[PDB]
């Protein structure tokens, strides 16, 4: 019952890769790279635990 | 409240007895009901 | 004109109720009053034509359960030995308690307010409090006060009727 | 619109199959690689037992009820819609937006501007399967009606408008989620749920879903799962052999329960009664089960094998309450 | 035209009547069975029943295809036809629906829907006007309020009308239901169609909303929001200044409604003497184990006296049973049995229902689980799930058999608090309800069982043979119609006990209340009730033996009855 959470859901993983191709829809290329996921990741461990300041 | 009649439970081996046989009497100089309804309308009037 | 319905007394379990006209005439003006129960003497009769519904006048009303009828109730009136008597005829079923009987009978004959000319009225009632045992058919003695008494309505113990509260 | 047989002998091929108890039940649901034993009770579920009536009295029915619950990232949802997919006339309801009055749903009349009295949820049940989603999240009236569906499988409707009872019969499938978020051992499975216990112990059998801190099914549930979400949707997968092969073994298969099973029914019943400090619930719940099994593989007699994995079915749910 | 058809197939249908009815001999009835039917009317004074099948006897349906396509047709013929009889002796759905169904015959069935009153009809309309002879009677009565004849042949006109004559003329009366089709048919998706069908007279108040029916074949349809339908509206404009437009709907009618939806054995049953024993083995096999609770389910089964007194307080006829066992021991079962059997009989675990479960100016008080169960048993289960002021309406119901704003017996089903019964700890502290309730509850049948393989194995073996098809025909030694056939006759023996040994009744209460006045240790302050409950027991059960004035024996049974019954709760 930390700040952290228990389960990680399958739907996480079903969201970032929808998050990641609207990533690369503002590309307006279809060129779906690593930096394009990782954005993606970015958002997440930085949208949760913004609570360390 | 103005009266308070409070019954009481002690274990009386006659008061049965009376209690048991009244009650086969109760399955077998008073006055009547229809009398005593008479009574209580016609006097409180 | 009257409405009545039928009673929800003697209703099959669970079926619903139906409804029949009744028509007052001269003595019997405003006789009953709602929250009742009533037995009817009427006379059947329909309507002619419209341009059959069936109206009930009424004869004689009857409520659900003379000068030698009084005096010779005063004679024997008179006697001295009523007083265990009545307590003695209160209720067989149970055969004991007088006590406790003597007040019941005394509370439903009543007590006078006596409002004074123009000043003020008291109180009229007398309080009747019994604490109860389970193992007791004290409520069959307040049933024998419903049946004999004027007008009694059995309150439940919670919430179960009436509301003795008119809203 | 659209009140431009033969297929048997290929039914018949497959019934021949030695595999067949694994590649029915793997071709169900490609979505979860696991839960083998809780699919095939969902495939016992619609040959769930001989619908048996006594001379006088009995008027057994061949219902079961199976809920399923755990810890979360399991997809249990989107399993239970699968099973409203496979079911002919399934009935998907929730948790919360039900009463009393799934059941009774009496209403008034626009056109004709009456009162028209409506059947409920659970009579689009009637044969079949139903689904309902969080049922430890139930209300007073709701969950509490299921007991004359688990008893007497019968609706009592008995008011000013209607005094009718009648019967829907139906197989009830749930799900729901615990108390805490992790379901902690050492600690009753009883209470760990939000369930009335005479009703959980009268269910058919209850499944435990936990999370796991391995990293192989973690992959293979990545890889699964991410072949599923890429392009966008060496077995046989039969789509609709199964579901004309149900449909058929309705009425054309009637297991026959005799005499050599029960020798083997008394002698596996004295050890699950050794178990104590096991009832007849149990026992009701193992020859449901054995001729639930016997009716799949089109099989018209019990046989003395299918029982035991039928009894280790319960047992695996019973090794489980140890904590 | 019509009336040549209609008066062959009237006069082949009287010779049908007047031929033979059914092809059964001697044994049975053997001809002439309408005219049995009709002296049987006779003797009661009521209508005809016809079959189907019957009518389609004599002329191999030649003459069923001729009513059956239109009866509307052969009404009068019909009626005619039997009224010279009388003075010569004297199934498809809504959607099976259409235009050409009208005058024919179809048989629907549905779901009865809202009731209707009762009102009466007319079809006799005595109008004429203000002329001297004012004594007409028009022969019209078709659906139309014309009371008043336009050509009487007084001096008066057809202008000049008067009222209809409400005082000579005979009347029926009626009611109109609205059937509902069956939820068993609709496919999904589907809300359910509604249909009008008229009930006409005799067969009046045979409805009940709630029922499978079958009907008269016959259709109508009744002349009348259906305005801007759209639908070419036909207007009455005759062929030759400006009548009324019109738009219908099908309707139905009938005349014929069913509602479908010894002494020599009970000789044997009352000449014999085991006959007690015979009814403890034969109530419940299904269950396989005691017998006990049998007992008293079977002495449950017979009332009471409850004869009356003088008009102050009459006294009750009736018996409680309430059982309270181990959980996961089948006792759904048992009460499944008990509802399975006994008349009148509601089952619930009432915890869905309302508050009211347990108990322009429709003031309509719903029924409750528990008020319907006149002269019934109400057994009710799971009594922690429920709360206190329930148990005080039980005790209402209990002690007035009234509730003023329930004439029953009740059948309990509890459970342990820990699930178990700790036999160190006492009775009193399992049953999980307060002191006058309890008491007033008349026997407790404790039941907790242990593990052993001999009685486990024996009873599962029973059991298990039932669900086995093959030998399930277990036999009990009475069956379950001859049994319900001697309940009915036991009801009707009003036991007058005249017996000395009533004093011994007493000195047995004393001795009953005084070894209940040592040990209080171990769970009871005996109540005056369980003293007139024991009254009743030795009523009921002397009424089981078909025995009046209750012998002693009777007494010293009902006594052991009683004293185990406690000694069971005693420990």
Same mark, same amino acid.
């Given at each position: 019952?930390?700040?952290?959470?228990?389960?990680?859901?399958?739907?996480?993983?079903?969201?970032?890769?929808?998050?990641?191709?609207?990533?690369?829809?503002?590309?307006?290329?279809?060129?779906?790279?690593?930096?394009?996921?990782?954005?993606?990741?970015?958002?997440?461990?930085?949208?949760?635990?913004?609570?360390?300041? | 409240?103005?009266?308070?009649?409070?019954?009481?439970?002690?274990?009386?081996?006659?008061?049965?007895?009376?209690?048991?046989?009244?009650?086969?009497?109760?399955?077998?100089?008073?006055?009547?009901?229809?009398?005593?309804?008479?009574?209580?309308?016609?006097?409180?009037? | 004109?009257?409405?009545?319905?039928?009673?929800?007394?003697?209703?099959?379990?669970?079926?619903?109720?139906?409804?029949?006209?009744?028509?007052?005439?001269?003595?019997?003006?405003?006789?009953?009053?709602?929250?009742?129960?009533?037995?009817?003497?009427?006379?059947?009769?329909?309507?002619?034509?419209?341009?059959?519904?069936?109206?009930?006048?009424?004869?004689?009303?009857?409520?659900?359960?003379?000068?030698?009828?009084?005096?010779?109730?005063?004679?024997?009136?008179?006697?001295?030995?009523?007083?265990?008597?009545?307590?003695?005829?209160?209720?067989?079923?149970?055969?004991?308690?007088?006590?406790?009987?003597?007040?019941?009978?005394?509370?439903?004959?009543?007590?006078?307010?006596?409002?004074?000319?123009?000043?003020?009225?008291?109180?009229?009632?007398?309080?009747?409090?019994?604490?109860?045992?389970?193992?007791?058919?004290?409520?069959?003695?307040?049933?024998?006060?419903?049946?004999?008494?004027?007008?009694?309505?059995?309150?439940?113990?919670?919430?179960?009727?009436?509301?003795?509260?008119?809203? | 619109?659209?009140?431009?047989?033969?297929?048997?002998?290929?039914?018949?091929?497959v019934?021949?199959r030695e595999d067949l108890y694994s590649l029915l039940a793997r071709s169900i649901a490609p979505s979860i690689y696991?839960?083998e034993?809780?699919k095939?009770?969902?495939?016992?579920?619609?040959?769930?037992?001989?619908?048996?009536?006594?001379?006088?009295?009995?008027?057994?029915?061949?219902?079961?009820?199976?809920?399923?619950?755990?810890?979360?990232? @399991?997809?249990?949802?989107?399993?239970?819609?699968?099973?409203?997919?496979?079911?002919?006339?399934?009935?998907?309801?929730?948790?919360?937006?039900?009463?009393?009055?799934? @059941?009774?749903?009496?209403?008034?009349?626009?056109? @004709?501007?009456?009162?028209?009295?409506?059947?409920?949820?659970?009579?689009?049940?009637?044969?079949?399967?139903?689904?309902?989603?969080?049922?430890?999240?139930?209300?007073?009236?709701?969950?509490?009606?299921?007991?004359?569906?688990?008893?007497?499988?019968?609706?009592?409707?008995?008011?000013?408008?209607?005094?009718?009872?009648? !019967?829907?019969?139906?197989?009830?499938?749930?799900?729901?989620?615990?108390?805490?978020?992790?379901? !902690?051992?050492?600690?009753?499975?009883?209470?760990?749920?939000?369930?009335?216990?005479?009703?959980?112990?009268?269910?058919?059998?209850?499944?435990?879903?936990?999370?796991?801190?391995?990293?192989?099914?973690?992959?293979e549930?990545?890889?699964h799962?991410?072949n599923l979400?890429?392009?966008?949707?060496d077995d046989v997968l039969p789509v609709?052999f199964l579901?004309?092969?149900?449909?058929?073994?309705?009425?054309?298969?009637?297991?026959?329960?005799?005499?050599?099973?029960?020798?083997?029914?008394?002698?596996?019943?004295?050890?699950?009664?050794?178990?104590?400090?096991?009832?007849?619930?149990?026992?009701?719940?193992?020859?449901?089960?054995?001729?639930?099994?016997?009716?799949?593989?089109?099989?018209?007699?019990?046989?003395?094998?299918?029982?035991?994995?039928?009894?280790?079915?319960?047992?695996?749910?019973?090794?489980?309450?140890?904590? | 035209?019509?009336?040549?058809?209609?008066?062959?197939?009237?006069?082949?249908?009287?010779?049908?009547?007047?031929?033979?009815?059914?092809?059964?001999?001697?044994?049975?009835?053997?001809?002439?069975?309408?005219?049995?039917?009709?002296?049987?009317?006779?003797?009661? #004074?009521?209508?005809?029943?016809? #079959?189907?099948?019957?009518?389609?006897?004599?002329?191999?349906?030649?003459?069923?295809?001729?009513?059956?396509?239109?009866?509307?047709? /052969?009404?009068?013929?019909?009626?005619?036809?039997?009224? +010279?009889?009388?003075?010569?002796?004297?199934?498809?759905?809504?959607?099976?629906?259409?235009?050409?169904?009208?005058?024919?015959?179809?048989?629907?069935? %549905?779901?009865?829907?809202?009731?209707?009153?009762?009102?009466?009809?007319?079809?006799?309309?005595? /109008?004429?006007?203000?002329?001297?002879?004012?004594?007409?009677?028009?022969?019209?009565?078709?659906?139309?309020?014309?009371?008043?004849?336009?050509?009487?042949?007084?001096?008066?006109?057809?202008?000049?009308?008067?009222?209809?004559?409400?005082?000579?003329?005979?009347?029926?009366?009626?009611?109109?239901?609205?059937?509902?089709?069956?939820?068993?048919?609709?496919?999904?998706?589907?809300?359910?169609?509604?249909?009008?069908?008229?009930?006409?007279?005799?067969?009046?108040?045979?409805?009940?909303?709630?029922?499978?029916?079958?009907?008269?074949?016959?259709?109508?349809?009744?002349?009348?929001?259906?305005?801007?339908?759209?639908?070419?509206?036909?207007?009455?404009?005759?062929?030759?200044?400006?009548?009324?437009?019109?738009?219908?709907?099908?309707?139905?009618?009938?005349?014929?409604?069913?509602?479908?939806?010894?002494?020599?054995?009970?000789?044997?049953?009352?000449? =014999?003497?085991?006959?007690?024993?015979?009814?403890?083995?034969?109530?419940?096999?299904?269950?396989?184990?005691?017998?006990?609770?049998?007992? %008293?389910?079977?002495?449950?089964?017979?009332?009471?006296?409850?004869?009356?007194?003088?008009?102050?307080?009459?006294?009750?006829?009736?018996?409680?049973?309430?059982?309270?066992? #181990?959980?996961?021991?089948?006792?759904?079962?048992?009460?499944?049995?008990?509802?399975?059997?006994?008349?009148?009989?509601?089952?619930?675990?009432?915890?869905?229902?309302?508050?009211?479960?347990?108990?322009?100016?429709?003031?309509?008080?719903?029924?409750?689980?528990?008020?319907?169960?006149?002269?019934?048993?109400?057994?009710? #289960?799971?009594? =922690?799930?429920?709360?206190?002021?329930?148990?005080?309406?039980?005790?209402?119901?209990?002690?007035?058999?009234?509730?003023?704003?329930?004439?029953?017996?009740?059948?309990?089903?509890?459970?342990?608090?820990?699930?178990?019964?700790? +036999?160190?700890?006492?009775?009193?502290?399992?049953?999980?309800?307060?002191?006058?309730?309890?008491?007033?509850?008349?026997?407790?049948?404790?039941?907790?069982?242990?593990?052993?393989?001999?009685?486990?194995?024996?009873?599962?073996?029973?059991?298990?043979?039932?669900?086995?098809?093959? =030998?399930?025909?277990?036999?009990?030694? /009475?069956?379950?119609?001859?049994?319900?056939?001697?309940?009915?006759?036991?009801?009707?023996?009003?036991?007058?006990?005249?017996?000395?040994?009533?004093?011994?009744?007493?000195?047995?209460?004393?001795?009953?209340?005084?070894? =209940?006045?040592?040990?209080?240790?171990?769970?009871?302050?005996?109540?005056?009730?369980?003293?007139?409950?024991?009254?009743?027991?030795?009523?009921?059960?002397? +009424?089981?033996?078909?025995?009046?004035?209750?012998?002693?024996?009777?007494?010293?049974?009902?006594?052991?009855?009683? +004293?185990?019954?406690?000694?069971?709760?005693?420990?």
């Amino acid at each position: 019952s930390k700040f952290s959470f228990g389960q990680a859901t399958p739907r996480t993983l079903l969201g970032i890769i929808r998050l990641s191709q609207a990533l690369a829809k503002l590309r307006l290329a279809d060129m779906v790279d690593i930096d394009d996921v990782e954005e993606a990741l970015r958002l997440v461990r930085v949208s949760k635990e913004s609570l360390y300041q | 409240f103005d009266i308070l009649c409070v019954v009481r439970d002690l274990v009386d081996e006659e008061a049965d007895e009376r209690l048991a046989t009244f009650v086969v009497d109760s399955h077998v100089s008073p006055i009547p009901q229809e009398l005593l309804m008479k009574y209580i309308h016609y006097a409180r009037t | 004109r009257v409405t009545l319905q039928e009673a929800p007394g003697t209703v099959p379990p669970g079926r619903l109720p139906r409804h029949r006209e009744v028509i007052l005439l001269a003595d019997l003006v405003d006789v009953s009053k709602p929250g009742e129960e009533v037995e009817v003497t009427g006379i059947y009769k329909n309507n002619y034509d419209g341009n059959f519904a069936t109206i009930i006048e009424a004869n004689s009303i009857k409520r659900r359960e003379t000068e030698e009828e009084e005096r010779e109730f005063r004679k024997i009136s008179r006697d001295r030995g009523i007083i265990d008597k009545i307590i003695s005829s209160m209720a067989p079923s149970i055969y004991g308690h007088r006590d406790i009987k003597t007040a019941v009978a005394c509370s439903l004959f009543g007590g006078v307010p006596k409002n004074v000319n123009g000043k003020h009225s008291i109180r009229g009632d007398i309080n009747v409090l019994l604490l109860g045992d389970p193992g007791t058919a004290k409520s069959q003695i307040l049933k024998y006060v419903e049946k004999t008494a004027h007008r009694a309505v059995f309150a439940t113990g919670q919430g179960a009727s009436v509301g003795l509260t008119a809203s | 619109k659209v009140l431009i047989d033969q297929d048997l002998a290929k039914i018949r091929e497959v019934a021949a199959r030695e595999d067949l108890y694994s590649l029915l039940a793997r071709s169900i649901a490609p979505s979860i690689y696991e839960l083998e034993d809780v699919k095939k009770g969902i495939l016992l579920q619609l040959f769930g037992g001989t619908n048996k009536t006594f001379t006088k009295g009995g008027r057994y029915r061949g219902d079961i009820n199976i809920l399923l619950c755990g810890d979360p990232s @399991t997809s249990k949802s989107q399993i239970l819609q699968y099973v409203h997919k496979i079911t002919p006339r399934g009935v998907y309801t929730s948790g919360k937006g039900s009463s009393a009055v799934l @059941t009774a749903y009496i209403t008034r009349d626009v056109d @004709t501007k009456q009162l028209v009295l409506e059947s409920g949820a659970l009579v689009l049940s009637d044969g079949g399967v139903c689904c309902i989603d969080e049922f430890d999240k139930m209300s007073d009236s709701t969950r509490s009606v299921l007991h004359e569906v688990m008893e007497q499988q019968t609706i009592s409707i008995a008011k000013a408008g209607i005094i009718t009872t009648l !019967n829907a019969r139906s197989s009830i499938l749930a799900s729901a989620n615990p108390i805490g978020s992790r379901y !902690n051992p050492n600690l009753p499975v009883t209470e760990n749920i939000d369930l009335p216990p005479p009703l959980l112990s009268r269910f058919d059998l209850v499944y435990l879903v936990l999370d796991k801190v391995d990293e192989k099914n973690d992959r293979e549930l990545a890889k699964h799962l991410t072949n599923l979400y890429l392009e966008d949707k060496d077995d046989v997968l039969p789509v609709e052999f199964l579901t004309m092969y149900i449909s058929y073994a309705k009425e054309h298969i009637h297991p026959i329960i005799t005499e050599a099973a029960k020798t083997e029914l008394v002698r596996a019943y004295v050890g699950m009664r050794k178990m104590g400090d096991a009832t007849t619930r149990q026992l009701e719940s193992m020859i449901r089960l054995a001729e639930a099994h016997a009716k799949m593989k089109l099989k018209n007699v019990v046989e003395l094998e299918d029982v035991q994995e039928a009894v280790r079915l319960i047992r695996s749910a019973i090794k489980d309450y140890a904590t | 035209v019509d009336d040549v058809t209609g008066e062959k197939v009237r006069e082949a249908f009287e010779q049908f009547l007047e031929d033979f009815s059914v092809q059964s001999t001697d044994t049975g009835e053997v001809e002439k069975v309408y005219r049995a039917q009709i002296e049987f009317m006779k003797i009661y #004074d009521l209508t005809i029943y016809i #079959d189907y099948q019957h009518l389609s006897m004599r002329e191999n349906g030649a003459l069923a295809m001729a009513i059956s396509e239109q009866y509307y047709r /052969f009404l009068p013929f019909l009626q005619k036809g039997l009224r +010279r009889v009388v003075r010569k002796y004297a199934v498809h759905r809504i959607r099976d629906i259409r235009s050409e169904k009208i005058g024919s015959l179809l048989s629907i069935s %549905g779901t009865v829907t809202r009731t209707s009153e009762v009102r009466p009809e007319l079809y006799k309309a005595s /109008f004429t006007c203000d002329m001297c002879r004012a004594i007409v009677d028009n022969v019209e009565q078709s659906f139309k309020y014309t009371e008043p004849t336009f050509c009487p042949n007084p001096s008066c006109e057809n202008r000049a009308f008067w009222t209809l004559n409400v005082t000579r003329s005979r009347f029926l009366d009626w009611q109109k239901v609205r059937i509902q089709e069956n939820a068993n048919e609709i496919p999904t998706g589907s809300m359910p169609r509604t249909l009008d069908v008229i009930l006409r007279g005799d067969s009046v108040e045979r409805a009940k909303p709630g029922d499978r029916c079958k009907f008269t074949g016959v259709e109508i349809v009744v002349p009348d929001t259906q305005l801007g339908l759209p639908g070419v509206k036909p207007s009455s404009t005759l062929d030759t200044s400006l009548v009324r437009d019109l738009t219908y709907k099908i309707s139905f009618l009938a005349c014929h409604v069913i509602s479908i939806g010894e002494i020599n054995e009970l000789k044997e049953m009352v000449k =014999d003497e085991h006959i007690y024993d015979k009814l403890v083995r034969s109530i419940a096999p299904a269950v396989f184990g005691h017998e006990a609770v049998k007992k %008293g389910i079977l002495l449950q089964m017979l009332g009471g006296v409850h004869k009356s007194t003088v008009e102050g307080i009459k006294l009750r006829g009736d018996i409680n049973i309430c059982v309270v066992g #181990d959980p996961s021991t089948s006792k759904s079962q048992f009460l499944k049995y008990v509802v399975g059997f006994a008349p009148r009989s509601v089952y619930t675990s009432g915890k869905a229902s309302s508050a009211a479960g347990l108990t322009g100016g429709d003031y309509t008080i719903e029924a409750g689980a528990l008020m319907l169960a006149d002269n019934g048993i109400c057994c009710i #289960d799971e009594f =922690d799930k429920m709360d206190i002021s329930d148990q005080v309406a039980i005790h209402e119901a209990m002690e007035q058999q009234t509730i003023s704003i329930a004439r029953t017996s009740i059948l309990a089903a509890a459970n342990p608090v820990g699930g178990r019964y700790n +036999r160190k700890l006492s009775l009193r502290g399992n049953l999980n309800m307060t002191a006058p309730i309890m008491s007033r509850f008349d026997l407790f049948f404790v039941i907790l069982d242990d593990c052993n393989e001999k009685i486990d194995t024996e009873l599962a073996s029973h059991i298990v043979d039932l669900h086995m098809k093959r =030998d399930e025909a277990i036999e009990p030694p /009475f069956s379950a119609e001859q049994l319900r056939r001697y309940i009915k006759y036991a009801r009707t023996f009003k036991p007058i006990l005249t017996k000395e040994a009533r004093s011994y009744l007493v000195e047995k209460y004393k001795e009953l209340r005084k070894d =209940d006045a040592q040990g209080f240790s171990r769970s009871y302050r005996i109540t005056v009730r369980q003293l007139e409950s024991m009254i009743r027991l030795s009523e009921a059960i002397a +009424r089981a033996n078909c025995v009046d004035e209750i012998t002693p024996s009777f007494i010293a049974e009902a006594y052991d009855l009683l +004293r185990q019954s406690i000694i069971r709760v005693d420990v």
